[PDB]
Design a binder for this molecule. Sequence first.
Ligand code: A1BG3
Lengths: 39, 156
Amino acid sequence: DMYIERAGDITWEKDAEVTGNSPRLDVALDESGDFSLVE
Amino acid sequence: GETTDGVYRVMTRRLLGSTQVGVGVMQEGVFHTMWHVTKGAALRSGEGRLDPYWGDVKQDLVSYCGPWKLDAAWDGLSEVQLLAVPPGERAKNIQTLPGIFKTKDGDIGAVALDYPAGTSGSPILDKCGRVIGLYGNGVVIKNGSYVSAITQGKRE
Ligand SMILES: Cc1cc(-c2ccccc2C(=O)Nc2cnn(C)c2)cnc1F
């Protein structure tokens, strides 16, 4: 039985850890809402 | 229940201790999360109940207490922030330039940041602090990492 707990305000934060790349990927979305890689 | 705007953890006691199954957004009195977090089940906020209002397994989205309210979109250019709320750890902003999911029905923003599955439903923000979608529905890549769509609903 599921419950919620507040964790923060939704705010842009100047000078936050900057990370992650920007990949362009061919994907398919199935009726179950699962993405998959096309090639 | 607590109805203040912000980001919330989604918890269960149906497993060992209290386990974080995901995250969501409270905005204008509506709770927003991903379908795969709740599977459309009701939620408790204190002694208050939140009932599902709208959901779609294909979009992997669900709203509680009202219709989907979040309508901002990735510009296609600017960096964004994942407000990651990982299990047992403080909310943390992570700033990143989205890549692109190319599909037969159009291009979607994607974020290449690796977090535990219990982070599903964390909001992705633009520079004005607007929620442009939710993190936690995507794909495992050549490298073994996770790349999440920026999943946004529609506001009617
Ligand atoms: C170990 C592991 C983690 C994840 C994962 C990582 C980050 C955010 C979300 C997920 C996630 O579970 N998504 C998701 C979509 N639909 N279902 C049912 C589940 C994905 N795959 C894995 F193997």
